[PDB]
Design a binder for these strands. Sequence first.
DNA 1: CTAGTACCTCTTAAGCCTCAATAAAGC
DNA 2: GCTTTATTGAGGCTTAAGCAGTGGGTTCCAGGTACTAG
Lengths: 85, 171, 112, 107, 159, 94, 53, 56, 99, 280
Amino acid sequence: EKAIPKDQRATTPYMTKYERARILGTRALQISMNAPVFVDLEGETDPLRIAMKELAEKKIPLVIRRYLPDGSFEDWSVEELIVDL
Amino acid sequence: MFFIKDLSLNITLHPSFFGPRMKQYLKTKLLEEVEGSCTGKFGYILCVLDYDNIDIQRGRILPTDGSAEFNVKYRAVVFKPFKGEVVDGTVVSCSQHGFEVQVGPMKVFVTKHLMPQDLTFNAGSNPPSYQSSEDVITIKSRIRVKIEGCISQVSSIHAIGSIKEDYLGAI
Amino acid sequence: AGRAALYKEVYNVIASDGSYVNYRHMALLVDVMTTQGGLTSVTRHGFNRSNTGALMRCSFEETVEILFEAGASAELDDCRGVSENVILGQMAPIGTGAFDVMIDEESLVKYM
Amino acid sequence: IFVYQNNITPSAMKLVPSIPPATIETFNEAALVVNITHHELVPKHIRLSSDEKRELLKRYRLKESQLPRIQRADPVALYLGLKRGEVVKIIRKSETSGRYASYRICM
Amino acid sequence: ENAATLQLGQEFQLKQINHQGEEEELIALNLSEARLVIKEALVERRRAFKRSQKKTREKELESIDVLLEQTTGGNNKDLKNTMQYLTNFSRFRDQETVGAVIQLLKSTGLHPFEVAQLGSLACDTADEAKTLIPSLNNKISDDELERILKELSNLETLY
Amino acid sequence: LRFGEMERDCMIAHGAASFLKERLMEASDAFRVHICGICGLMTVIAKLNHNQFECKGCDNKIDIYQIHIPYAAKLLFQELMAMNITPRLYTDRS
Amino acid sequence: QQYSSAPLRTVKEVQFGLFSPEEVRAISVAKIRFPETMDETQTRAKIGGLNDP
Amino acid sequence: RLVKALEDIMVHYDNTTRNSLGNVIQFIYGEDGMDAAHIEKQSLDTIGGSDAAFEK
Amino acid sequence: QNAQRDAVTLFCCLLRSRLATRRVLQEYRLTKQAFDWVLSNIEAQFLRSVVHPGEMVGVLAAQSIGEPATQMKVTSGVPRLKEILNVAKNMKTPSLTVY
Amino acid sequence: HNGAPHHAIEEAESLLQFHVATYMDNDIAGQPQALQKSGRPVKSIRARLKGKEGRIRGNLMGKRVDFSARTVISGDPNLELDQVGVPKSIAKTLTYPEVVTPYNIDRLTQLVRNGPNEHPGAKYVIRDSGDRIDLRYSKRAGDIQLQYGWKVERHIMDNDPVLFNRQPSLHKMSMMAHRVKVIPYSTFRLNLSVTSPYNADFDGDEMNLHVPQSEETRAELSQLCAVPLQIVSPQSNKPCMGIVQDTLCGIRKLTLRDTFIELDQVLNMLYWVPDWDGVI
DNA sequence: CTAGTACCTCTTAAGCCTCAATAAAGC
DNA sequence: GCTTTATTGAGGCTTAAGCAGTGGGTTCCAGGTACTAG
Ligand SMILES: [Mg+2]
Ligand SMILES: [Zn+2]
């Protein structure tokens, strides 16, 4: 019951800097552990650069759970989030 | 005792196994855990149904580790004996203290002091058996006995029963 | 009115030497000092006397007395505070740690 | 509403709760000589109905104790006669924003 | 302590929770229904494996054994023993019979465990049934108990 | 070096929760402790070689969860236990 | 440090209730009755005492 | 002392500054909800100017 | 909606003061494309200026209030800040102003 | 058990209570403090949890760190704003556990072959099982073949984010991330401007450098707390870090209308700007 | 005789109990 | 009309608090006394 539907979300759709940093770190950690890469690499080996490129191309399949103080959580996909930075 | 209920299982997966087939792989790890499981809390897990309808919740990523923790909720049928119930089984072995009866995935033992007076052990037949004034018991026999006590093991369940009320024994 | 006077005094003392501090910080300070019914002084007898997490107040000057009080009252801590997570060595609900990151199994297939 | 000149003996104070259904408030002549609300520092206080309180809690998703607390003997509460579990909205003028709306619930 | 006097444990409550949080009534099943659901689960597993890889007491036992070996075979030897125990002394072989039995038991509205025992255990006299489950003594009328017992006996399959 | 309280709050302001967790749990003393799901006490007998888990305080067999915490945390918990204060570590919210 | 089969999950709440003497006895595997911290010859720890194995 | 008092206060996704207990210190972060760094000193023309200047 | 409108009231006043027809046409000579670009840039900057969720507002406020004190008739300076933070039932140099 | 006179029993009970109280709380107000056999008061659990030296504020709120260094700081105009000089010895001692991957397998193998003694190398190679093998103690370091999933403690290289801080962290901007630049000297070197947020004076001031040990930490430091991101100070909503004293004087002198520059100096100044477009 | 071995030895913030007055109820 | 009450408050005494980090040089194996083993 606490979970809110996909619509009727009061959180800001625009990506937060903390969320961007967390997603980049998680993607870099996964890539460093021999995880699949969804974007072709043009002579690039740094995990952080690959994560940034994937975020730019919105190829990151991670999720963000916006947690309200009460406890309810709202799910947001990386693709729909807008990267202002 | 043949009860269908929802069970939640937490499964850890390495981030390396992240391809499309991971789901199937995850399912395999589910098949290697629920089958053969025997816990005193939830009893013995019998089977898991609706394999194609299994729903997996979004995986949980550790704060620092790259492993993904998925909480999968599935409907499964489990078995758990209770004191005072009567169940039927097949004799598996014979001994001086009594004969063990395999029933389902569990074993049942009957105390000698709680046996009919007419019933008596006999070693004159190969293998040793029991003779009664109006019943015959051997290794290959269906015996219905009442369970009076239950013992829980790490990966096994044992039952202690007796045959004193009427209509019990060979049927 | 007391909160407004406290904010004005804080602004005056900060600007006495010419230093400039944004209004938001002073507003937050006065709000936290006035969030309760009265004015909660920033001391061991003020906010440290509230009903926050036991470990959070333990990290303040009063260390063992608060533990004894919690034991007597059997206080329950939800571990939502920074101090609780720091002591437990877990990612506190702060910024990056406030939320959690999951995996979409439906987008993964199409992204592959 | 009852207003005294010098002071109120404790006997009247303990007798006041003798009438639950009827609420009686005691005020000092000196205290009411000058209206507090006319002061610039005090913002505008508006009483909220039970339905308004429920709607506010539902929208913001707050409990009774999460809202800011205000003393029972607060001069503003006495002026408005706020009761226990009553939420009052405070509208204030600030330099950073044109106005700000907060809420306070009596403890 | 768990016994036959309806003093279930902290988890075996009369109500159960659902994946969506809804509360439902506990539902039990008999041996025939258990076998049917197990067979359906095995068929579903076989279909899943096939799609993933793409891109009279003498013959039924062999088919069940080979099906178990093909999928979820070899992980544990207890599954085969349980399957043999269920199959060797089963009562109903047709889905219609078990469906009718469960539909009839639904009308009774008794505790799921009691109806499961009645549909699984065999009784012939009122006194035997009463002593079998002393707790369920002043719950079911003698006439109703006799009627349900004779109906269950008649519904028994002839193997 | 010592990670001072001032640095701790500065990093908290920075919002680098992961950095603080790594610093206070990986770059510093690291311990793994077992707690029951009913009594929530670190006094759990866990033979990893035999994979046998059992707590004398509570009659439970398999209700044990492992948690990674600094050695200082368990030291403080034991000291509190000496003072008849029992921090009941639970993995779920009541 | 060593492989463990117990599930891994961070703590979410910490109750601070009192420690009952009965719980102390139940959890206290050993007993202390020898003030000496070591046995004779200072080779083995006192049995059922301080610094017991 | 200030750090200890203000340690638990954080702004959530609802733009309300709340402590560990969840009490709302401010329904809006600084009565504006904007980021402190982005704030800058700017002049308001409406406040200044005479009636004739405002008209023209 | 009311809270959102109240919060951005000052910024709306600023926009009306600056983005006035007289100013846009007399003081400025912006065109359709230029005006649209200005509106889009203003909107984007305002959206970026929103407070980032999860930021430790309390810790930032504590640091901002503490740094000036370290940098630094009527009592003032560090003693005044300490008195204000504390309950300070007794006043060293109490004062009152009446107009 | 040997007869209870009830007189000495009270004294024994009081002594036991005093001993228990001292054990749980050595310092009792208005009561004598138990004295240890040696010339020091007996330490109790309550004393062990009192403050700075207590476990709460001595081992939980603030605890020692393994991967970190502390040393003096010196000015360096020839370093970028986000770039901090690092001694070669400190870089060798400090290490990062980079996991073996196909992308940089050759680089990690070369670093391992170099060995701990050589700065561009490593000192440990963590295997899959988790056991750590030292390279200096092992004479067959060059014969070890790296495998996927392993981790190697490689020396910090260039463009490696690391936090730099000064012990008096009065404000938020006193701890910021910098890109490591290895230098052949035993003194940390940082940009001139970052002195203002750190309040650095170079008069023997000692600062601390912390090296991240995970990808998550590196990403968070690069994205959350980075010197370019810390230029704007929320404390006064203005840039706390700016030009420095001598640089300010030089730029003021340069901007003077009466200041003219010869062709040679103009060309050199144009070339100095790394991002100069190229047109004079 | 001689030498081991142990046993004794400066500036505030809250709590509480202890004092001096004051209006009402018993009688 | 007089006596005995619950209440109000006001200070003495008390128990608490007391920036962060780091480099170094000194000192403790404690004194006497009696009982007992080689
Ligand atoms: Mg200096
Ligand atoms: Zn336990």
